Swiss-Prot record, chains A, B, C, D, E, F:
It comes from Pseudomonas aeruginosa (strain ATCC 15692 / DSM 22644 / CIP 104116 / JCM 14847 / LMG 12228 / 1C / PRS 101 / PAO1). Its EC number is 2.1.3.3. The gene is arcB. Keywords: Arginine metabolism, Cytoplasm, Transferase. This is Ornithine carbamoyltransferase, catabolic. InterPro entries: Asp/Orn_carbamoyltranf_P-bd (IPR006132), Asp/Orn_carbamoylTrfase (IPR006130), Asp/Orn_carbamoylTrfase_sf (IPR036901), Asp_carbamoyltransf_Asp/Orn-bd (IPR006131), Orn/put_carbamltrans (IPR002292), OTCase_ArgI (IPR024904). Pathway: Amino-acid degradation; L-arginine degradation via ADI pathway; carbamoyl phosphate from L-arginine: step 2/2. It is found in: Cytoplasm. The lineage of its organism: Bacteria, Pseudomonadati, Pseudomonadota, Gammaproteobacteria, Pseudomonadales. Disruption phenotype: Cells lacking this gene are blocked in the arginine deiminase pathway. Coiled coil: none annotated.
């Protein structure tokens, strides 16, 4: 049968349009099967190592729940118990772990670490996140858009506002390009994906019928679009006191009711991969609100938009589990 | 059938006498069923998130073992991977988690956090501990007392000595009041539960036939009682050097052989929810013994009492698992 | 049937030659059964607590995978959630845990802690590692040697080079002595096992037909041997700057191609219990290489030997799981 | 969990009060589970050797039925096929049998034989009866008393009349002493248990709160008691013609309606471990009736008492099976 | 449904024609089901006591195999371990056994013992044989005849030659009478069944349409008959030396080729319930042959007839198992 | 597949070398499968009759346990309930039993009885022992030797000392001859196997490459041998008083430390099929010790040798079960 057995998931760069559609279909069906009670376990007796170099509760929980639903077991290796590179090489770690587990998930920093893991483990390897890509999130995003739209994938338009020179901007552009979707990126020119990377997406877009539009004008990027996406651009690393400029620079790209209106579509929906800074209800948010009283009603998205029917972020977050299950099942199942 | 399906466990304040007795009965029966080998799994394929804002090995292990016995799976979210309030609101966390898990356990600080979790999760929520209440422990305590007594619940008398202006004093009084038990609290007047809270327990006591006695005299509180309860009152937060006054103040309420004798009952038993500071065998205990040579044989309870047939603290600790299982089963099972 | 039901694994000191051979046989058979697909689960519904006072991913993963394969569940208690001795005695912890779990694994420092755990738990207790012994590793080592050799156990010769005044030197000598194997230890006289301990191994050797050779000459210790073992001797506790002397002292015992050649056997294999410092590919290794440019190609073993057919360290690491399974099965199974 | 896995049952002398209560609880629950249809088999695939040096249909049938209910198999070795000591030592027999069976039951004469069996078998060993003790019967007796009484164990009083210098007198005193029960023995001073043995029971009684009363006056021993126990004292070994003196001597201790009345309790019940000589309906009984016309209506108990609501001997006999099952399950089950 | 649940099998005297036919039908069907592989076990978890006061391998094996096929367990109580009446009454034994087992089989001497067993056991009781009746054998005989004949039961004729004043003569007459069969008994007038018994069979025969013919002339009794039955008449109790008269007296009733011919039917078959004395191949037979050289070729039946196609004794013996199974199933099964 | 379905086991005389090796392999594998927990039952619903003309607890228990492990049932027919030949021929018994059971085991005296059983039963027949052969023991012996040796079967040397003109001497020689093993028999010339029998073994030896050495010199027979076998030669039939000559005659063939040393192999092991007379600990042994004070430390083997690492008699005894299972499985299983 058409299958993707023993396949890794490192970036989506080497996954064809037919492969991605298969995974989207499988996600949809596995989702319906759980809610319907028709799900069958095909990962019984599979043991999966989840290595997290940096804590990520949403990705972790998504992997745990998916694995458990399918009858597999997981060993969660936290940031403290994990320091690949410090005392032992990833080549060595991969060789030991590949001999005890059936598949390995890795969530870290350098993409080449995940690729080294994949080179030496001997078992399927999944990238839970790196600086360059976030493959699981993209499949979750498209599925959400797909089930919250009446048009086929190639008829969907979407815009991502904010800092795009990262694994989210890089990824949102790539999956739209592989699926022939109309994708727009509104960001300051300095915060755009690397030209070398856009150039590879233009390559995929020409093979799939997609249109990639990069621009610095948000209202232009959001016109007649079906979904508005964004993400936290504020730097949690830099002290709240040193954010003044980045806020000044990224604030016009903020998703508020006005941008939601500017789409000119009453059906448009909002998406954020979470956590989102949509208020002061947080402790960090209360500080931000201080140094910048203006950001008291949200930073990248406002409470108005966030706590409204526009927001489908939670369905989107749920779809992260159904999607990874499709990855585990297509890769490891006896089907 | 009479049931408590889809019910939360946040404080026991909104649980009737019939509901608590049902849970006590179910705990007893599930306990006998495990030892007898007649236990059947009714939580197969249930996934439960255990959020611990503060490490609590006994509560954690009790939840893990109960869930596993019943065929469910658990995702343990530790204090490091958990900071509800810092970077993301509990309203947001609850909405995401409620979409991946079948029930959520929360162990933290502010009771309103657990209540917010419960308002927004969409799935049953259990309180593993807060500053105001410790519901799971109370059911475990009454069951232990119940199986280590010949009288029915309403015939049992018990006294708790020590600091009562906390989740233990608050809770021990509340469950005795809902079950028509004779409950006595011996503590300095300043360390008594809030009057507003005692007033609500007086309300429940008048409906159940209970007698709540608060007093500063320990020998009086322990007369003709069936069980003597206590707990660590010494402040682990404050440096051992600054404990002199609290020790001076709380020392007369210490459970020793004399208090055990003063009950005038050869059948009376001792209870402590653990860990207990009954000697110097610990590292902290060795320090305490230094600044206060007198506390070298125990602080809230003495080694004499602790390492004697009086002590049923370990059965009590075991009953914490059988009890939470009754909570999981009554709330989530297919029965 | 001949069995070791309800038996602890604390040091191997009280395990006879027949018992160790049974375990080696069971490991071999359980290994073949997993690869063949004939494995049956006999730990279904068993709950096991894994206490790790110090992080040990390889031992942890070995226990997790073994337990899961056999149908049991595990509760991993990390170094943060575990401080036996600080706030609560091991006697108390053991009493509570022994009432919720079916067996307890402990990995810590003082051997007497594990022995106290075993005295009071009431359920089987396994030592995952202490300063004095590492029982699980030894069974894994002999099995590996056994399956990578054509001679029976008593015909196998092996040498361990490096610091021997520790749980590895202590253990490698003990298991060779209980099995009538030809064991050699090449180390500076100061880094030899205690005489009192060697004396007890001489006792076992005289009962099994073994030959224990301690010496300071590595080429002599490695002559005509089947396996060369070693381990990290460099002190991770002491700053890299203060290692000059220990390196000076232990460097001649380093396993390189020359020592591999000096065995005079083209069949000889290399063993290391990992992690190994065989290059600069690590961050610590890059620092070491700086202060000591000479150790840029490996410290206790060189990259030449490590990345060659001589190296069977990864099979050895895999055998750590099959072995612990034999421990869990012989101790807890319904067989 | 609290357990007694791999434990032998040789005399009850080394079983604590908590252990005996656990077994009483388990017996009660396993009994209810069989009648309720909730029993689950946990001895599937267990093979048990039943060695009977002397025919004992009631003990044999109790063991067979218990084992079968639980899914195990049994090999009954009769008195003819069994002569441990004649042609082969028990040390040798135990070593062979311990290698084929999962547990061994022994019913013979010298207690040290059972203890030798236990020393060398390598599998759990149960004592079905010796000259010194009858452990299975005692658990059966207390359970019966417990379920036919409204008071807790420590509130129960019982008297055994007849020859007490045997495994019944020895045993009835021991189990009452370990459970803090009020036990009375009415017998001629010469037929009392050894002082050395009473002294050890006084030791246990002082730890449990029991009162042991030995006396030669039956009406005194039976005052306000809950259960009257007795047993055949007549010597089946000695010809009926030579019984005149023993009958003369033991006749005043006979349980008749008068003794039943003398208890001063209308709730008191009668117990006998069977077979009982309560009439002439037997062939031996018809002979006895001849030489001693007076014993035509019963010897140790009379037909009046035996065929009346006082008699609970048959429930008592049934409880012998539920009890041994608790022994098999606690010792060998996968629970 | 039409059923015979909880029914005893003591003599067949209180079993109607419809009940016996049901059992014959069930036997036939259970037999076909075993050979066809369609048999289902409906006695799973049933425990059956087989009491044999006198060794009877064929009846014992028939009961064991039937029970085992159906999933039940059996406890075989041999003649040594069984002496109902000696030391303990059957009323007492029945009361104890009825509490441990689900049904009891009894094979002894006095019919009233089996009836006493049945009065007091509380569970179904089966008569494996007494002096008066042999119910299981009769059902086995008719079934055999039925499957080795083309006519319906009421069209079958059969003759039994030999000593008829016993459980075989008594039984062969009774089952023919309850089923409206043509039954003939050829025996010396002194060896006929009691008149009181024949009179009761005449009663049944008049209700079923049967013809009972008693006579002293064998050739007359065997004319036009379908089956010739016989049995050992020689007294194993009396020494071979004292048999001269009984042999003289019973010899003309011997089944030889002449009697087989005298039936005037080439289809007629021979039946014997075994063991049969058809030669000298035995040790007893070799002695008989000595004192009486004439009986060297068979006593009640000759080797000619026995080792010929006439003989269906072995099918008959097999049918003893299928028949008892019908008894166990109709009485105890969940159908 | 290569199989031995429906095959009897009467002597091993008609079993080829390939067949015996298959059985040795199957025994080894079934043994590993039981200890590993991978055993599957393939005799479910099989009923096996075990006829024992002479009590043999070790063979009986071996058959019972094997059958039970595999899911079959057994009917044990004891020496009292069995007298084939007395009242009924084996031809008749075999015909009846072959119709109720799936296989029959026979343990008696005359080999021709077992062969008659096999001729007429119609189901597989196994010889548990006769005067001429003991097939099950031989397979058990070779397996034991095989697993306690490093050489292949044809490289193994063994010597049997004692009376060889019996089923042990006959059998030990035959299996060595069929497997090309170096077998030596040290015995007085009068106690050697019949020449006619040795001649047939010489025939098999020439086809397998074996060397059969008969001799009267024990030290010569034991030189460079791997296993020393022996057996009780003392006549239990003849009164201890009449043994003087046989002891005088057979004493030099006794296995003591000297003979163990005389093998010139530190690896050599001792074997005895049990029971062994290695001391006075028995009642018979205490008598022997009297008439012959010299035999107070063992007769055919001494306590020194018996209670030492030389002795593997108990493993040997265990292997009797794994071996018969291979016989039952190869003969009756659905594989």
């Amino acid at each position: 049968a058409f299958n993707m057995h023993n396949r890794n998931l490192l970036s989506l760069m080497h996954h064809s349009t037919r492969e991605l559609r298969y995974l989207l279909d499988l996600s949809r069906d596995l989702k319906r099967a759980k809610y319907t009670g028709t799900e069958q376990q095909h990962l019984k007796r599979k043991n999966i190592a989840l290595i997290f170099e940096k804590t990520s509760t949403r990705t972790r929980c998504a992997f745990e729940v998916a694995a458990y639903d399918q009858g597999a077991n997981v060993t969660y290796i936290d940031p403290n118990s994990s320091q690949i590179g410090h005392k032992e090489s990833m080549k060595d770690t991969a060789r030991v772990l590949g001999r005890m587990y059936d598949a390995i998930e890795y969530r870290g920093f350098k993409q080449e670490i995940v690729e080294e893991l994949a080179k030496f483990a001997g078992v399927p390897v999944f990238n839970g996140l790196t600086d360059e890509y976030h493959p699981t999130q993209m499949l979750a995003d498209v599925l959400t858009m797909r089930e919250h739209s009446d048009k086929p994938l190639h008829d969907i338009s979407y815009a991502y506002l904010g800092d795009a020179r990262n694994n989210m901007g890089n990824s949102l552009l790539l999956i739209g390009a592989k699926l022939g979707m109309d994708v727009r990126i509104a960001a300051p020119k300095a915060l755009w994906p690397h030209d070398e990377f856009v150039a590879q997406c233009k390559k995929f877009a020409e093979e799939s019928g997609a249109k990639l539009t990069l621009t610095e004008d948000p209202k232009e990027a959001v016109k007649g679009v079906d979904f508005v996406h964004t993400d936290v651009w504020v730097s949690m690393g830099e002290p709240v006191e040193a954010w003044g400029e980045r806020i000044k620079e990224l604030l016009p790209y903020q998703v508020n009711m006005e941008i939601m209106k500017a789409t000119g579509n009453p059906r448009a929906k909002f998406m954020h991969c979470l956590p989102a800074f949509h208020n002061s209800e947080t402790k960090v948010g209360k500080q931000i609100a201080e140094q910048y009283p203006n950001l008291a009603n949200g930073i990248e998205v406002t409470e108005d938009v966030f706590e409204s029917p526009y927001n489908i972020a939670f369905e989107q977050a749920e779809n992260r589990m159904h999607t990874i299950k499709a990855i585990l099942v297509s890769t490891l199942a006896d089907i």
